[PDB]
């Protein structure tokens, strides 16, 4: 509801917009309106994976949003897209 | 025998007769000149272009026969 | 802009008439949602625009043919009822 | 292995898509605190005192029940509510999804023939109540007609050339009336001599002269080659 | 009554509760619904003006073509028609019965000229309004809505003065002069 | 291209704006001219429509949103 | 809430707002007083509607007067169309009737310029 | 209380997303259909057996020498419906099609329209090759993609669609 | 006074390998082909799910 609705009010919009927040994917077309009944929740890891797809401690951001926020270069190709957008729009 | 309106209805022309047509369901009323019937909750449904005067009506309950003189 | 004159714009009938926040990790993580949102809506109006200078293509395409394919009925039937 | 991700009921029902970057399919466990495959579960928290609950993902690369649904099928049989006659049932690859989309309700008998698939399915078996294990083989219904009471619907992972009537036999036996029936075809084990639709296409006529009328197939080849969902219903009363 | 069973619905196809033949598609309810009518009987006294005119245009079509009582009756009743405004252009004699229609002798009624010049904004509104007796035509106040103007009186279907809807309207556009009274 | 070369349908490059008159430079040309051209018609259209709704107000223009406008 | 009328005024291309409500007695063209009125030679012909009928009729309403338009002789033309027929329609509304038609008699006899506006014109001979 | 701008109440006369787009076969390359090779099942009808009667044609004979490989002929029983229906003057047909060479399917639909059971049962599997005489069916099939068809003409059969007919 | 010519069409063969590579991936986008199943861990299928459609051809 409208209570949990700002902390998860950005990350299921950028869901909706997963089409172009890496320039590698290309997720196929649909609208995906923001459903009435949604559940965050985090994957656990398997015990026997291990060195292979398991985050760290340390590096285990709390949020979708902090974990995106994580890497500067995908937020490299953030500010240079975003950069040459605005100076076109100008 | 329970106090129940079904349909109550003033209607401004002056109705001589009428009479229950099978059920509670459907009733016609001899109107000023034009026979009409009615449903349950008091809507109209047949002004009846015929019957273009009625006094007396009755209805023949088996014939389903709704007779008007 | 569409300017409109003072004189016509206060004479109109009435139905067509033209009629706190946080300093720091907050306001710049929603820059970051203006950034993507902005970068997805250029992004897919270039896919639309695309889509459709596409049939345009396969609207001319398909009327020369459609247009070549019909003269070729009608000729067709018209040998037919020649054949009388 | 670590990231958060999003959870939204599918059309069926009991099976849930995981939206995060990628998105995952996945079903909510009947067991939780434990992985029985190996695969990854994503564990969600309700707020009462908060509950912990947990959802295993559905792996469609070794499950061709869920190759076949997001591969996209127009509809199962397998709802929360009802029973399911898994044959073929070779271990807890797909049994434990099916069980856990049945739900703590209703039944899957499912049934193996070999041993030692046999043995590691019933010591998965003790960790979830709602599923049965048949050590018997398939091709005799009879020597477990004891035990299963009408199914209402079955699935069909058995790999042997006799497949026709391996599910003719089983759904008369305990297929209830207008119930479900979803098949995995093999083609390089039901005949590799000939090419693969064309033994669909014997295995469809087969199972239309078996009275179970088909609804619907799927190829489901951006996962497995050459196997085909086939789902119809047991018609029993005017085929036509 | 029960949505009947497969062999009843066979047994018995004809019957209709609700919708008898002689009710004609039910199109005086329909179109008095459409255009708000009051009272029962309006149609019908409309019908028979409408079977009225199209039996006369037919007599007038039987004289024969030279004669002056059969041509000047005829563009006599054409030009009342047009005064009454039943029609909108002096057309051919063949409108009489492809134009003349119930619905355009309702189309000249008070409430739906009143909608149609956007007096009101509904017609059930201004059934509201002119029953309680805010307008006038010319000089005279309408208290019925029975009253269907003529070509003649769609320029003054104006509100009275101190009606205050009026009122409002004009202090909606502060245009409120008060040594008018109104 | 069929009974010509490429050199005959080769290119046309179009001249810039002089560096003389350059305060107000970019000289427009015929596509420029008429993407401005039907935008002014636009305009003007409008006005017209506007100008004649003005002009038939039929000032007993009565609603029930006159209390919430002003 | 409070006691008011709005009323109007024309002359050729002038037009005066008049709000008339009950008051302590202050006449005021644009927050100005009604004595410093230009072009100061037709101040008489802004002050004859509160000088025909007497300052009493004028002790209990307070007057504001808006203008727009036109030139000198026609902004103190509206100016005194709209402060009479403010009066008159204070008096038609919230007090006596009587001497509602009282003032329109005072008035029509002196000039009915100074109530009704002489608008349609001219003469195609 | 009484309520303004009452109507006599007649009756109201009036007021009283799994999309499915059929993926396209795992057999199917652009339009070549790479998934049949001999031994082929070729769908019989009826105006087909008639043709090839009337043109004294046999039957697995005469697909094997148009075809050059084994040829199952397959009838299903709606398209033996129509061609009892035809009466009497076809008992030849009959008899013909009643042949032991000739293995026949069995239809699930009401009615016996034969030409809408073939162009169906043909889009779900695009494993048969359909033999046929009508006009209309021809032109279905040959707007379907990649299924091959053949028509009796001259003294044999005609393949239309195949890449392997030499 | 040629028009332009090209180095593809220079080698018949070359032409037909480099259009089979073409129609190889022109129909990764017609049906899904298989590819070589699992290829790493299963991390998700990395381009999306959606729910009202199916791909599944229906008998009549
Ligand atoms: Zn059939």
Same mark, same amino acid.
């Given at each position: ?9 950005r ?5 909706k ?58 937020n ?15 | ?9 003033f ?5 001589h ?22 449903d ?8 009846l ?21 | ?46 896919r ?37 | ?50 509950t ?22 127009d ?5 929360p ?95 209830k ?42 190829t ?21 | ?27 005086d ?142 202090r ?11 | ?40 018609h ?29 | ?65 808006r ?35 009282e ?23 | ?16 997303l ?41 039957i ?13 002929? &397959?009838?299903?029983? @709606? ?7 035809? *009466?009497? +003057?076809? /008992? !030849? ?29 043909? &889009?779900?599997?695009? @494993? ?7 006009? *209309?069916? +021809?032109? /279905? !099939? ?25 | 006074?040629?028009?332009?010519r ?28 298989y ?26």
């Amino acid at each position: 509801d409208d209570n949990m609705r700002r902390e998860v009010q950005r990350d299921l919009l950028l869901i909706k917009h997963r089409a172009a927040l890496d320039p590698k994917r290309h997720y196929k077309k649909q609208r995906w309106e923001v459903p009435e009944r949604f559940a965050i929740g985090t994957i656990i890891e398997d015990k026997s994976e291990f060195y292979s797809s398991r985050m760290n401690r340390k590096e285990r951001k709390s949020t979708i949003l902090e974990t995106l926020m994580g890497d500067e270069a995908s937020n490299k190709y953030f500010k240079r897209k975003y950069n040459e957008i605005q100076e076109k729009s100008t | 025998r329970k106090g129940q309106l079904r349909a109550e209805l003033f209607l401004n022309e002056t109705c001589h007769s009428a009479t229950y047509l099978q059920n509670e369901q459907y009733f016609a009323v001899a109107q000023k000149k034009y026979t009409f019937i009615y449903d349950h909750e008091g809507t109209e449904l047949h002004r009846l272009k015929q019957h273009i005067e009625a006094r007396h009506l009755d209805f023949l309950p088996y014939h389903y026969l709704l007779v008007t003189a | 802009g569409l300017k409109v004159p003072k004189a016509v714009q206060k004479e109109l009938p009435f139905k067509s008439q033209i009629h706190v926040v946080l300093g720091g990790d907050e306001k710049k993580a929603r820059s970051f949602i203006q950034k993507v949102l902005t970068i997805s809506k250029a992004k897919d109006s270039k896919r639309k625009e695309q889509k459709a200078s596409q049939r345009k293509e396969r609207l001319k395409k398909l009327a020369k043919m459609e247009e070549e394919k019909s003269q070729r009925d009608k000729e067709k039937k018209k040998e037919y009822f020649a054949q009388n | 292995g670590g990231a958060k991700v999003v959870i939204e009921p599918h059309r069926h029902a009991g099976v849930y898509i995981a939206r995060g970057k990628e998105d995952l399919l996945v079903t909510k466990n009947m067991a939780p605190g434990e992985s029985v495959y190996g695969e990854k579960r994503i564990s969600v928290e309700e707020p009462v005192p908060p509950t912990k609950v947990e959802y295993r993902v559905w792996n469609p690369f070794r499950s061709k029940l869920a190759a076949g649904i997001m591969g996209g099928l127009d509809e199962l049989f397998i709802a929360p509510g009802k029973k399911v006659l898994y044959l073929g049932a070779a271990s807890g690859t797909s049994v434990s999804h099916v069980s856990d989309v049945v739900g703590p309700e209703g039944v899957v008998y499912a049934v193996e023939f070999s041993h030692r698939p046999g043995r590691e399915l019933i010591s998965m078996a003790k960790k979830r109540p709602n599923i049965i294990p048949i050590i018997e083989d398939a091709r005799h219904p009879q020597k477990y007609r004891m035990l299963i009471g009408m199914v209402d619907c079955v699935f069909a992972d058995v790999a042997q050339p006799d497949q026709a009537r391996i599910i003719a036999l089983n759904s008369h036996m305990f297929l209830k009336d207008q119930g479900g029936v979803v098949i995995s075809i093999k083609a390089n084990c039901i005949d590799s001599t000939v090419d693969a639709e064309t033994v669909f296409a014997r295995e469809v006529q087969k199972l239309r002269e078996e009275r179970i009328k088909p609804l619907e197939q799927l190829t489901l080849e951006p996962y497995e080659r050459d196997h085909c969902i086939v789902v119809g219903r047991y018609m029993r009363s005017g085929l036509k | 009554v029960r949505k009947l069973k497969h062999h009843e619905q066979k047994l018995l196809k004809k019957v209709d509760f609700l919708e008898w033949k002689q009710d004609q598609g039910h199109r005086d309810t329909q179109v008095m619904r459409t255009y708000h009518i009051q009272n029962r009987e309006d149609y019908h006294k409309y019908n028979r003006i409408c079977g009225d005119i199209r039996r006369l245009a037919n007599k007038l079509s039987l004289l024969p073509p030279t004669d002056p009582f059969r041509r000047k009756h005829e563009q006599l009743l054409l030009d009342k028609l047009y005064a009454m405004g039943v029609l909108t252009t002096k057309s051919k004699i063949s409108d009489l019965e492809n134009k003349v229609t119930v619905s355009a002798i309702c189309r000249r009624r008070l409430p739906v000229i009143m909608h149609r010049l956007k007096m009101a904004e509904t017609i059930q509104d201004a059934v509201k309004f002119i029953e309680q007796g805010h307008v006038r035509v010319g000089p005279n106040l309408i208290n019925d809505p029975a009253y269907l103007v003529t070509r003649n009186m769609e320029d003054y279907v104006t509100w009275v003065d101190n009606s205050k809807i009026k009122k409002t309207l004009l202090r909606y556009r502060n245009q409120i002069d008060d040594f008018d009274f109104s | 291209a069929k009974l010509v070369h490429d050199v005959q349908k080769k290119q046309h490059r179009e001249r810039s704006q002089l560096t003389s008159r350059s305060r107000y430079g970019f000289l427009e040309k015929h596509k420029d001219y008429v993407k401005r051209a039907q935008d002014f018609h636009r305009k003007q259209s409008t006005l017209k429509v506007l100008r004649e709704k003005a002009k038939e107000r039929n000032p007993d223009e009565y609603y029930h949103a006159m209390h919430s406008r002003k | 809430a409070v006691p008011s009328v709005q009323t109007f005024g024309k002359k050729k291309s002038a037009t005066a707002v008049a709000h008339v409500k009950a008051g302590k007695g202050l006449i005021k063209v644009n927050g100005s007083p009604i004595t410093l009125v230009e072009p100061e030679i037709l101040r008489f012909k802004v002050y004859e509607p509160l000088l025909l009928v007497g300052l009493d009729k004028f002790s209990n309403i307070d007057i504001r007067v808006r203008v727009t338009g036109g030139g000198h002789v026609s902004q103190v033309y509206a100016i005194r169309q709209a402060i009479a027929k403010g009066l008159v329609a204070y008096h038609q509304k919230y007090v006596d009737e009587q001497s509602k038609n009282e003032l329109k008699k005072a008035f029509t006899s002196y000039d009915r310029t100074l109530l009704i506006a002489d608008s349609r014109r001219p003469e195609p001979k | 209380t009484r309520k303004f701008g009452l109507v006599k109440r007649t009756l109201n006369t009036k007021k009283d997303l799994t999309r499915n787009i059929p993926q396209v076969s795992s057999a199917l390359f652009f339009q070549y259909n790479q998934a049949i090779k001999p031994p082929y099942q070729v769908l019989i009808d009826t105006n087909f057996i008639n043709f090839s009667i009337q043109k004294k044609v046999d039957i697995v004979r005469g697909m094997m020498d148009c075809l050059l490989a084994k040829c199952n002929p &397959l009838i299903t029983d @709606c398209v033996m419906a129509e061609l009892e229906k035809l *009466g009497p +003057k076809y /008992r !030849i047909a009959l008899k013909l099609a009643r042949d032991p060479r000739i293995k026949r399917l069995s239809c699930s639909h009401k009615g016996t329209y034969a030409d809408d059971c073939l162009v169906h049962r043909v &889009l779900q599997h695009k @494993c048969y090759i359909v033999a046929t005489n009508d006009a *209309g069916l +021809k032109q /279905r !099939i040959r707007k379907i993609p990649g299924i091959p068809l053949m028509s009796v003409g001259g003294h044999a059969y005609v393949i239309e669609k195949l890449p392997d007919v030499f | 006074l040629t028009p332009k010519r090209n180095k593809d069409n220079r080698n018949s063969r070359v032409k037909k390998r480099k259009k089979y590579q073409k129609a190889q991936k022109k129909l990764k986008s017609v049906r899904a082909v298989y590819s070589g199943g699992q290829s790493g861990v299963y991390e998700g299928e990395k381009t999306g799910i959606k729910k009202g459609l199916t791909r599944s051809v229906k008998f009549k």
